[PDB]
Design a protein around this nucleic acid. Sequence first.
RNA 1: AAAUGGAUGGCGCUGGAGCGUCGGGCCCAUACCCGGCCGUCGCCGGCCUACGCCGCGACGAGUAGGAGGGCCGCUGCGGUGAGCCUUGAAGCCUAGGGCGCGGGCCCGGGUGGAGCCGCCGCAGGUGCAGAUCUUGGUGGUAGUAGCAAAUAUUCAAACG
RNA 2: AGGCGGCCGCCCCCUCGCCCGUCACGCACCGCACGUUCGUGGGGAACCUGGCGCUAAACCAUUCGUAGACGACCUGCUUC
Lengths: 153, 148, 50, 129, 195, 109
Amino acid sequence: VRYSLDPENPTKSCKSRGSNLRVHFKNTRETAQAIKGMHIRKATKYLKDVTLQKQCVPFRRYNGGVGRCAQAKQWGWTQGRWPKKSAEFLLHMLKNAESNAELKGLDVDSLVIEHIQVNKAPKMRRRTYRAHGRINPYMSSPCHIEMILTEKE
Amino acid sequence: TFKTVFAEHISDECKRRFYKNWHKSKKKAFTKYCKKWQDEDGKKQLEKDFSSMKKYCQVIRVIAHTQMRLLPLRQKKAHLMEIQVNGGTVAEKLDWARERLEQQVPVNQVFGQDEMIDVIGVTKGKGYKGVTSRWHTKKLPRKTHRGL
Amino acid sequence: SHRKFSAPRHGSLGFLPRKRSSRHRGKVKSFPKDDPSKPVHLTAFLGYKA
Amino acid sequence: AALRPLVKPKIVKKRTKKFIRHQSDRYVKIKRNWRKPRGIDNRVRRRFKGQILMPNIGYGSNKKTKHMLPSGFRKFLVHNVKELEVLLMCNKSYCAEIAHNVSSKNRKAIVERAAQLAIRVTNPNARLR
Amino acid sequence: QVLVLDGRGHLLGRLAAIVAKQVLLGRKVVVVRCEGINISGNFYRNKLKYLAFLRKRMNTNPSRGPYHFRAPSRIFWRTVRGMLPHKTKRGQAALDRLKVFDGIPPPYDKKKRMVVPAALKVVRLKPTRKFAYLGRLAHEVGWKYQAVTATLEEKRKEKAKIHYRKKKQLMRLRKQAEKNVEKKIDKYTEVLKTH
Amino acid sequence: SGRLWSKAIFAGYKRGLRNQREHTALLKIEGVYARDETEFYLGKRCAYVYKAKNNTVTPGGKPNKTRVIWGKVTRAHGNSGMVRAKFRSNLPAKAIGHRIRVMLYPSRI
RNA sequence: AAAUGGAUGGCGCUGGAGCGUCGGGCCCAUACCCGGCCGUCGCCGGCCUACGCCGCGACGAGUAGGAGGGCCGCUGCGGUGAGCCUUGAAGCCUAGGGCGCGGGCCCGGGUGGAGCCGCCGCAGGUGCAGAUCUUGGUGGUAGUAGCAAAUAUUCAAACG
RNA sequence: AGGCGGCCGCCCCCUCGCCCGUCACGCACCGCACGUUCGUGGGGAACCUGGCGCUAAACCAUUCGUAGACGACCUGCUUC
Ligand SMILES: [Mg+2]
Ligand SMILES: [Mg+2]
Ligand SMILES: [Mg+2]
Ligand SMILES: [Mg+2]
Ligand SMILES: [Mg+2]
Ligand SMILES: [Mg+2]
Ligand SMILES: [Mg+2]
Ligand SMILES: [Mg+2]
Ligand SMILES: [Mg+2]
Ligand SMILES: [Mg+2]
Ligand SMILES: [Mg+2]
Ligand SMILES: [Mg+2]
Ligand SMILES: [Mg+2]
Ligand SMILES: [Mg+2]
Ligand SMILES: [Mg+2]
Ligand SMILES: [Mg+2]
Ligand SMILES: [Mg+2]
Ligand SMILES: [Mg+2]
Ligand SMILES: [Mg+2]
Ligand SMILES: [Mg+2]
Ligand SMILES: [Mg+2]
Ligand SMILES: [Mg+2]
Ligand SMILES: [Mg+2]
């Protein structure tokens, strides 16, 4: 499999992938824009604080009908939400990226996330029952997740 | 607003008004200004201001605050005001203000009995309520589908 | 059209921008006009409703 | 600086825009090819100013300089050696151009034979090792 | 570069026309003393026209719609808005080039002030016609700053009277100097070629 | 030292009310306020001078930010001394209200 | 004297930017003139693809409709190109280079992995924006409405 | 809506700080544009340099309830 953004040098770079994992695409995109470009220890502390709701994740693009929070003013934005499950899956992907840095034998402290990406996946269909005896589909929207991490100097 | 002059000492209640988080703040508001009052070269630049203030201004407003130590509230922040002095000429108004800097002003010194005196405040809070409780409009009768 | 029973209109339109105030200490919109004849005095106070 | 053909004048094209189809900007199910709008209301047919311009016979180029490359030759496609050797008589007006499905092994032999016969080849240095 | 125009005894529409044409070409023009602009016609009709203009407003939300400026500088500025193509991004740069000031600012206390002759009351109005004062009109309609502007204008006229005596003193000294001698070697050539 | 060119302000295009004619320009030119006055300026040349962040020149010494579009005066235009002009490439129409140099080129005294 | 706030177009305009009489200049449409270029038509000319070649002159709008031309295009068939290709064809993409007034085409670059085209004739189920078109897919609406008929759960431990 | 304007006393130099006249060179780049400018323009990223100083404040977490649909708003949180 390939990756968008072939990195600057694969010697100092490690990478990770997630294929067909049951999350929401929109929540994972809005939390990936929160993570992207931050150091890895700050990102791990951040995604441990998201699941305990001490610090939030801003919503920027998919901002429809999302209520306000006080914690959003760190990001210069007015709308925030605390996705548990997206933060858990992205924490697991960061742990896999940590283990791949361990296998390639790098400086485990000074990684940053140079590139991250989330895109939609082939969705699965259930169905509901709406009035006058009608059927309407009820479909998920899982995502594929790429991340490319690079050593800071 | 021409220029503002504050007094030689500023109490902790006013400093707590200037700050937001007194627990976090290092109290550093108004130290260099009091040092300007203290030193002699500061006074020369300071006494030049009251010479200019007599010359141009129509209105002099005096900044004061409440003593929160006497009150049984929990707030402990002094509220600041502007109080326009409606006395005579600007010279004696400014002499009155510099004569009474850092003094207490009792209520009996300004108001008097039987004086018809207006009140300005902020009303009660009743929250985001509806039309019939806001504008005192009339209820629709019982038979109305979707709301009365 | 021609409502057939004219009512005094509810509320006042003069107070229309109904709004939480920008300040909870009630500021003074205007102080009364001075004269040079009177001796020097003040015109305001703070108070606490009990 | 290759062959410098005969006298070719300052070519005028009268418009260089390759005229677009009406409402092809608004959709992507309309490709960019021109097609005569035959509506009963259409502003392009009514020729309102500020709308697009229909191609017609007035925009045509000069018969002296029709089908002229800016180098000064008229182009002519070629597959192999014999069809290259037909231009042995008229090289100073008609340039050769090797077709896209000619392989490199025969393509270098064609460009070498053209270099002997002094015939302009407009894409001589593509698809090499 | 800057055309500093006076406003006493000019006409509203004429001065607006000349400023509006000069501002589209780039010469940055500043209209000073806006309160002294005279409007032709009887000023009862002038307040009647501007009062009906106040009556013209949107009935659904008066915040969105016709802003009725009351200061006379803003009156003249709205009149020049009505004559420049402001919805285009040409006239918006033109209005940003244009500046206007009721009263006189401290740079324009001392900068020299031009007077447009094609817009003067003296030139345009046949003398038995009635005119207006835009200061009178603005004080009747909502501009609450006449009593400040009158005081400041008295103050600056008092300062200009103390400057003019000094300048006339210098000119008396230089004509005493030209009454003295030994400039006359050059003055024959100068009178031959237009002193 | 000293300025050799006369000052002129680009006023717009030759136009009707609705449509323009972009192959010709108009020039309000300072010091000229009469049809009789705008006769000396026929046949002179005009140049538009501007800046660009690439570095391209003519024999004026060294590479500069400066670029210039040339052209020349055709004929008088109206009573108010305004002057038609034709350039080699048409105007950017950025220059409405920006000064176009009128040079003392073809002097005919 | 009429209902939302508004219309000599607006701003405005009074030794006029109004009314009536006029003058001298000045502005400009695809109209006119001059000049270039394309096509149609006509009148020819030459014993130079004679279905080509030049020359002259007048003219060119257009729905319903009618003809002519198309070295415009798709798919197949006989003939032909000592056609083209595993040293890379078809198809696809392309801020690349061009041609034609266009229908469209040619080359460059990258994918791609086994067939493809030019010309002269021939034959068609032969060219898409629509038909509340058919089938297949995906958006905005949107992480929103909504997971509320019948009272109700709480603590500790265990396996994990 | 003021930072430019002016005076005085001292400081190292100019007595060509301007006109008329004598004298000879300076790139004379051999016909040619975008030249002269207010510019030691305006803004941002950094690099070495001497001198003068400075050692914070928001927002969150929490608490209040004069305020709240959520935000927003009023407040408290010194080791006495
Ligand atoms: Mg909501
Ligand atoms: Mg259901
Ligand atoms: Mg059923
Ligand atoms: Mg309440
Ligand atoms: Mg009912
Ligand atoms: Mg007020
Ligand atoms: Mg019709
Ligand atoms: Mg009217
Ligand atoms: Mg036709
Ligand atoms: Mg295969
Ligand atoms: Mg083909
Ligand atoms: Mg093909
Ligand atoms: Mg078939
Ligand atoms: Mg069919
Ligand atoms: Mg279709
Ligand atoms: Mg159709
Ligand atoms: Mg349909
Ligand atoms: Mg469908
Ligand atoms: Mg859908
Ligand atoms: Mg809702
Ligand atoms: Mg919901
Ligand atoms: Mg239920
Ligand atoms: Mg366990």
